[PDB]
Design a protein around this ligand. Structure first.
Ligand SMILES: CCCCCCCCCCCCCCCCCC(=O)OC[C@H](COP(=O)(O)OCCN)OC(=O)CCCCCCCCCCCCCCCCC
Ligand SMILES: CCCCCCCCCCCCCCCCCC(=O)OC[C@H](COP(=O)(O)OCCN)OC(=O)CCCCCCCCCCCCCCCCC
Ligand SMILES: CCCCCCCCCCCCCCCCCC(=O)OC[C@H](COP(=O)(O)OCCN)OC(=O)CCCCCCCCCCCCCCCCC
Ligand SMILES: CCCCCCCCCCCCCCCCCC(=O)OC[C@H](COP(=O)(O)OCCN)OC(=O)CCCCCCCCCCCCCCCCC
Ligand SMILES: CCCCCCCCCCCCCCCCCC(=O)OC[C@H](COP(=O)(O)OCCN)OC(=O)CCCCCCCCCCCCCCCCC
Ligand SMILES: CCCCCCCCCCCCCCCCCC(=O)OC[C@H](COP(=O)(O)OCCN)OC(=O)CCCCCCCCCCCCCCCCC
Ligand SMILES: CCCCCCCCCCCCCCCCCC(=O)OC[C@H](COP(=O)(O)OCCN)OC(=O)CCCCCCCCCCCCCCCCC
Ligand SMILES: NC(=O)OC[C@H](O)[C@@H](O)[C@H](N)C(=O)N[C@H](C(=O)O)[C@H]1O[C@@H](n2cc(C(=O)O)c(=O)[nH]c2=O)[C@H](O)[C@@H]1O
Ligand SMILES: NC(=O)OC[C@H](O)[C@@H](O)[C@H](N)C(=O)N[C@H](C(=O)O)[C@H]1O[C@@H](n2cc(C(=O)O)c(=O)[nH]c2=O)[C@H](O)[C@@H]1O
Lengths: 790, 790
């Protein structure tokens, strides 16, 4: 088990002086005393782990190590997040005789993750801490910087945690099996907290095994909170913020996910972003997809995702940062300023909005024995509107808006490209669909919520010009939402127009008509099957259907590209053949050539230039084709699955022995049955009286279950979506009954004109959005360079 | 509580001599002895019930009543249906010193039914038994006929039974609360059986209360089997046939349902049908809908159901009886010959086929403690095909086929119109949809299964002509299935053709075009919403949507009728105006008039004549219009809901405390944690070794759950249905890409010709099916009259 930039850090660190601070222990005789009447145990760590440490001396009983390095602390938390601070629950960092002030709380979220992912994340975090320690000419960082950093690992579900990751944590010395206790004082233990200052560092993380060593390892404070039962990720974040954060009172809480490996200096970059400008309340960093042992052709999906991530980080994030409002801060890698998230005295704030989703989106079955029964009952008893009861879709996204549009605060969200983190994307199609479900639902709901409540920014204490530019950004987001809502209909219309144009006898393409008919039938069949499967079955089961649909859509996209190129070439040849003193004006006056070629070429050129200016050009070559061929799948399959499954009904449905006859030694059975005549007569009379009366009306008027409400919401949403898309399609191609209001010959020309108008509208909308994002990213680069010079 | 044809019965019955047979009791001291090592208790009934009986004498300790009338018997059954006969479980009728042979077992099925429905059913059964007792010149029936009849009430679910019906049963004296025991000898009690010969008769059953009296009441043997847990209706029938039937070994098992009130002589009619012809193995009787306190206009649905029931009993049942094979025998009121249902020595038979559905259609989670674990495990381990694993859809329907097409037996199914039973239909729309779901699914699956396996009748020992006529019936059923599969597409095509025909400028109707467009849009919206709701929500929740859709479809049907009449009148006027020596030949040569008018009028006339000949003409006037206006709803809404919900997933998903720390008198907490250095080091080494190894491949290859299989089957079914219907629609109206292969002017004429051909085909298919059924019912009447004369 035990065996260039990194090297630099090691030279600056002395590594000889790492004596820990003394703290009071808990007596463990096996009666054990608990601090403040809580179950707390300071157990000794395995002697081998102590022996590994350089400072260890065989003669000394504990090796001469400090109290913190010698003993690991275990606490049983029964109250839960809401009352954790109210009760006298004390964490070790704040229990020292000299209080320690936290500067950076690195939260890590875990759920049945392999030990490899956790090892990678911990290696990244340890490298960042080592870099911070090595920093010499820093006012805040340097010697004894590890005391200001706490790493919190919140594992969701005691029985769902992977055994190998748990073994990894045990190897670090944080966790021990015997300590954990199910109940204390007849009270269920909601969480188990293990605290230890580990001096064990992961040397390397191969594909199959993890190697940890004690050589050149900086001590790290580790708090491992294992939850008794799984309550999703919102509950984990409630533990992180509502309970642990209040006790620690940190700054710049960093949120990480297992499998996300930050760079060697990424966390320093995030901290510096927060430090330079005091108005910044949230920050995000570049997220990359690993392509180590994945081929270009064998894994089209991975490379398509790589292209999507690169384009996002190059165009979307910089523009939103320039405007000061970022729609989404990735939960896998982000950072928030703790004070900015605090609620107001009235009790309304970003954290309240974020947490309300968990309580509202759940079965209305509250256990009376829970100590948070009063809070949950009061929240559920409150009248909730559409937005409040559907907050669960937005998730972290809501926070961003609530931070920017505060009542009287001046907060901004910023994106830094210096911070980089690498994560593993889902290779399988089913996992990819499942991941995109919640991403799409959250994006849509957050956009709708922000646009509806755009007026809340009026009262915020921002400069007038800042408000004007925020309104410009809101207008852009409204246009983007409108475009995204009509994506499926626009795709179908473009496909139909391009395929039917090849059927025209003017151009010399014989199979065009038959191919168009066949493709139409296949397209309809694929859409219908996608809807049926999205409602009926699970993606993991019927994966082959989705694979076939994706392949067909890729082939169709290739055919559409070929058709567009053929049409443009034919239009140019028609420009030439006749002979009209050919000039650039005529080329730009031809609707076909202009719309089909110029707009798409301009969009591609803008993407190419944006990639080049950021010194990240490879993705434009290696991964462009895969993304282009998968685009229709993104619009059709993922969107249909997401909208069909807006409701996430995780909870199931709903939720005195008469006697016991035991055979005795003899054949007789011991029974207790009525014997006296009096009781038999009384029971008979009671039955007579029970049936002797008419039936009263039920009039239950029960509240009923919330699953029906969410299912109704989802059904209404999908129906409205279908209706609007079909209205647009019928208006463009004269598909419904509209054809009756025209004649045999007028219909063709009218349909052609409408199709041309629609094509030019959609293509130029896309091109102008691309230009807007390009200008945004150029401004981001210029301002960041100027700031760096300053 | 205690207060003309019927009168006749009372005059023939003496009522003075009703002494019961003596039987051995079980000692009840409170140690009680159980017969054959089973938990059996013979308790005394309430003294007031004994006092009511005329024969009661105050001086006598028990009133001089017989042992059976004095004591009620309670038995606890732990084994279950499969092993009930193998174990020494003895029922009281067979326990007499002189064995009693059962002639008619009247099974009644109950599930949380109101005491009113049970009271009505019991009143009907008691009246039938009284009539059988009164019969004088009968070889089998007459004095002491009540000894040959046993009434079995199988209640599904101990905690789901309604309290008022249970109180009714207690009032009869069958049930007592104290006796029931949950466990015996550490074995769960699957069923609780209460046996009593009750002399209490329900005098009248008002709307709100039930009145029972002891005057002029014939004793009735009652066996009330209360099941511990609900296992649906197939398990109840398994209890009735597999377990109770074997012990009783009865003939002509009668199946009834709560709320079904047979007539005064209906059961005698069924028994006589079985007795006259020995080849008969199953029989069914006329089922009627009560219209006592229900108005014509206030309850369209009830009257529509009345018309449907009357037409079924007048046309479908008689024809199928004449052919000797009835597709469905109503489970609410039917009768079967017990010997015919017995399986073969090889173990294959109608009952095995019927029961396999319960075991196959359930979660694959078998409790090892069940005594039927071996049987269920063997059945599930067996390789099951599509038909075997989907038997659950057919339900009782399967039995009929398996009875007719036996390997070497000669059995027939017969329908008798002398037997009548009245039942309450679901007034609500949601309940009606839920009821029709399983009816439609069973009808479709049974038709498919019978048609695929039509060859099995070759080996049956039937006359050659009988086999020929059975093949003719199979051909008719194939045509009916084909027509029913394309119902929705045919309805849409007819609607579209009729609405568009009004748009023609030849006829003088201005709003036609706009109305057709609006109706098309509304029709599409209704179909799409029906699909979405059928997949997403429950009928009870979103009932208003279904109500609105039904109302719209009724309005559309009225408009279609108006359009057809207008078109026919216009065609006749065109025949006349020009002047062509008008004759009947020209009227019959005009496609419009002929198809639209003659076919529909002929169908209506056939229905009218069939109703008149059966002396049941009122339904053709009172309830015809409601059925006509609801027809499209039947085809669209019910069929869509049934196909979307083929899978009936009733079962849910899926299905060691670390320690306990108790605070002592002192502040210390009592805990058990590792102390010795050795064990700590050993645990650390174990964790190191656990993580020190590479991850082995899962390779689970698990069978997985059956819910996915059924969902997949349902999705495939709906997809195939949609595809076939759309292919037909596209072929008829040139709706898809077919229009591209024609020109501006040819499309109109070609579409018109295809529409005319389709209309004539469908209308004449319906008319010929009606004529076939009419001839069938006439033959049934003639043969029944001839038989009656004989
Ligand atoms: C063609 C391209 C035309 C580009 C025109 C815009 C160029 C930048 C002009 C910047 C002027 C800034 C004036 C101002 O006061 O805005 C408010 C804020 C500075 O004030 P603040 O720091 O918030 O409070 C003190 O300043 C800001 O918030 C600046 C936000 C600038 C975002 C620019 C992104 C433009 C991308 C879309 C272009 C269309
Ligand atoms: C887009 C058009 C898609 C056409 C169908 C593509 C099917 C691709 C395929 O090969 O998958 C076969 C799949 C295997 O399913 P299976 O693993 O047996 O399910 C186990 C229970 N979960 O499923 C099967 O084996 C069933 C085979 C096809 C059944 C007919 C499906 C018709 C669906 C299209 C109808 C037109 C709309
Ligand atoms: C959900 C995903 C699919 C969405 C598709 C929405 C379809 C909108 C239909 C628009 C339309 O107007 O289609 C044309 C037709 C009406 O015009 P018509 O006169 O019949 O034909 C003119 C020919 N030049 O209207 C029609 O084509 C009628 C459409 C068929 C309705 C039949 C309803 C019962 C059967 C359901 C089949 C399901 C589809 C299967 C597809 C494979
Ligand atoms: C135009 C109308 C034409 C009607 C022509 C059919 C009229 C009835 C002719 C009955 C001939 C019976 C000959 C025969 O042997 O058939 C077998 C069976 C009698 O033999 P079995 O009792 O089974 O064994 C000894 O006999 C039977 O099973 C009789 C079954 C008769 C069902 C007739 C229903 C006809 C309705 C559809 C008409 C088209
Ligand atoms: C005036 C009276 C008009 C009555 C019209 C009634 C239509 C009935 C259509 C029909 O029955 O078709 C057969 C099938 C339903 O089969 P069925 O046995 O009747 O019901 C089974 C449910 N238990 O259902 C189907 O196959 C549907 C076939 C399409 C039905 C089209 C109906 C067109 C109605 C035109 C009315 C013209 C009136 C002309 C009056 C002069
Ligand atoms: C056929 C066309 C049907 C058109 C819609 C008819 C609606 C009839 C109605 O009045 O029902 C209102 C219904 C009430 O629903 P509610 O009781 O609040 O649900 C509680 C949660 N189970 O539901 C509502 O109150 C929601 C109100 C309508 C929401 C928009 C639905 C659009 C559906 C049609 C889209 C086009 C396809
Ligand atoms: C399920 C229940 C509904 C079943 C409907 C089945 C529809 C079959 C469509 C048949 C068809 O060919 O429609 C016509 C059109 C193709 O022909 P086109 O050239 O576009 O128009 C010719 C005008 N003379 O094809 C079309 O009309 C295209 C149909 C729209 C496909 C859009 C897919 C994304 C949006 C889904 C909308 C869902 C429907 C909402 C309806 C309200
Ligand atoms: N830009 C971007 O986000 O990419 C990142 C990458 O693609 C993501 O997949 C990344 N691995 C990721 O974050 N996955 C999960 C998630 O996103 O929800 C994270 O939540 C944790 N989790 C999941 C639960 C569940 O699955 O039900 C649960 O019940 N409770 C709980 O705590 C889980 O341990 C993981 O850390
Ligand atoms: N021609 C025609 O059939 O019309 C008859 C009329 O319209 C029907 O409604 C009639 N009342 C009827 O039979 N209803 C039920 C059914 O049909 O299944 C019957 O089954 C019994 N039942 C239902 C269960 C459930 O509901 O889940 C269950 O779980 N276990 C169980 O034993 C229930 O006590 C009733 O007796």
């Amino acid at each position: 088990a035990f065996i260039n930039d990194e090297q630099e850090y090691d030279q600056r660190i002395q590594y000889n002086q790492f004596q820990g601070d003394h703290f009071d222990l808990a007596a463990i005789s096996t009666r054990a005393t608990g601090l403040n009447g809580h179950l707390v145990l300071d157990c000794p760590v395995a002697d081998e782990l102590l022996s590994k440490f350089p400072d260890y001396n065989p003669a000394e009983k504990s090796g001469g190590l400090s109290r913190e390095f010698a003993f690991m602390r275990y606490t049983a938390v029964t109250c839960g997040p809401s009352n954790f601070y109210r009760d006298a629950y004390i964490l070790r960092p704040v229990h020292y005789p000299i209080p320690r002030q936290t500067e950076l709380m690195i939260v890590i979220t875990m759920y049945n993750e392999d030990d490899i992912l956790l090892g990678r994340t911990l290696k990244g975090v340890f490298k960042n801490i080592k870099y911070l320690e090595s920093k010499a000419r820093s006012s805040t960082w340097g010697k004894d910087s590890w005391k200001k950093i706490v790493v919190c690992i919140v594992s969701d579900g005691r029985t769902k945690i992977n055994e190998r990751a748990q073994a990894l944590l045990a190897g670090l010395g944080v966790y021990q099996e015997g300590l954990a206790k199910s109940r204390v004082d007849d009270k269920k233990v909601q969480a188990h907290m293990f605290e230890y200052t580990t001096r064990v560092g992961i040397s390397k993380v191969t594909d199959d095994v993890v190697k940890l060593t004690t050589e050149k390892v900086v001590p790290v404070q580790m708090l491992f909170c294992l939850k008794e039962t799984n309550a999703k990720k919102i509950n984990s974040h409630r533990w992180c913020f509502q309970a642990i954060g209040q006790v620690l009172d940190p700054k710049i809480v960093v949120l990480l996910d297992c499998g996300t490996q930050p760079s060697g200096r990424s966390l320093y970059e995030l901290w510096k972003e927060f430090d330079r400008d005091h108005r910044v309340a949230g920050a995000c960093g570049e997220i990359t997809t690993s392509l180590k042992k994945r081929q270009m052709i064998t894994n089209p999906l991975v490379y398509g995702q790589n292209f999507e991530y690169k384009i996002s980080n190059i165009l979307d994030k910089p523009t939103e940062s320039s405007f000061g409002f970022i729609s989404v801060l990735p939960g896998a890698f982000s950072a928030y300023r703790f004070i900015a998230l605090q609620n107001d005295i009235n009790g309304v704030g970003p954290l309240e909005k974020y947490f309300k989703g968990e309580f509202l989106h759940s079965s209305g079955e509250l256990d009376p024995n829970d100590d948070e029964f009063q809070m949950k009952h009061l929240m559920l008893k409150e009248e909730a509107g559409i937005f409040t009861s559907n907050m669960y879709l937005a998730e972290d996204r809501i926070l961003c808006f609530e931070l920017v549009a505060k009542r009287g605060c001046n907060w901004l969200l910023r994106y830094c490209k210096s911070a980089r983190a690498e994560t593993d994307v889902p290779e399988g199609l089913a996992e990819f669909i499942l991941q995109r479900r919640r991403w799409l639902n959250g994006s849509f709901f957050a956009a709708i919520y922000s646009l509806v409540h755009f007026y809340k920014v009026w009262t915020s204490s921002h400069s007038f010009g800042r408000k004007i530019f925020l309104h410009i950004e809101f207008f852009y987001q409204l246009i983007n939402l409108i475009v995204s809502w009509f994506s499926i209909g626009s795709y179908f219309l473009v496909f139909r127009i391009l395929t039917t144009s090849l059927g025209d006898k003017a151009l010399g393409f014989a199979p065009g008509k038959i191919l168009s008919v066949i493709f139409l039938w296949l397209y309809l069949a694929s859409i219908v099957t996608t809807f049926v499967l999205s409602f009926g079955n699970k993606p993991k089961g019927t994966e082959k259907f989705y694979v076939t649909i994706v392949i067909f859509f890729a082939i169709l996209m290739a055919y559409m590209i070929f058709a567009a190129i053929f049409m443009a070439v034919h239009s140019i040849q028609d420009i030439y053949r006749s002979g009209t003193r050919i000039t650039v004006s005529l080329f730009f006056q031809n609707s076909e050539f202009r719309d089909l070629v110029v707009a798409t070429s301009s969009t591609y050129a803008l993407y190419f230039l944006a990639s080049f200016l950021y010194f990240e050009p490879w993705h434009m070559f290696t991964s462009f084709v895969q993304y282009i061929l998968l685009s229709p799948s993104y619009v059709n399959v993922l969107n249909i699955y997401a909208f069909c499954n807006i409701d996430d009904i995780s909870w199931g449905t709903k939720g005195k022995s008469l006697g016991e006859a035991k055979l005795r030694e003899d054949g007789t059975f011991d029974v207790s049955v009525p014997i006296s005549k009096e009781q038999i007569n009384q029971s008979y009379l009671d039955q007579l009286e029970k049936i002797r009366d008419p039936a009263p009306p039920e009039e239950k008027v029960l509240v009923t279950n919330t699953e029906d409400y969410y299912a109704f919401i989802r059904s209404m949403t999908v129906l409205v979506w279908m209706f609007t898309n079909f209205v647009v399609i019928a208006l463009v191609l004269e598909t419904g009954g509209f054809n009756q209001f025209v004649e045999a010959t007028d219909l063709a020309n009218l349909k052609s004109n409408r199709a041309a108008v629609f094509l030019t509208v959609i293509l130029w909308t896309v091109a102008f959005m691309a230009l807007f994002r390009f200008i945004g990213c150029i401004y981001y680069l210029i301002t960041r360079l100027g700031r760096e010079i300053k």
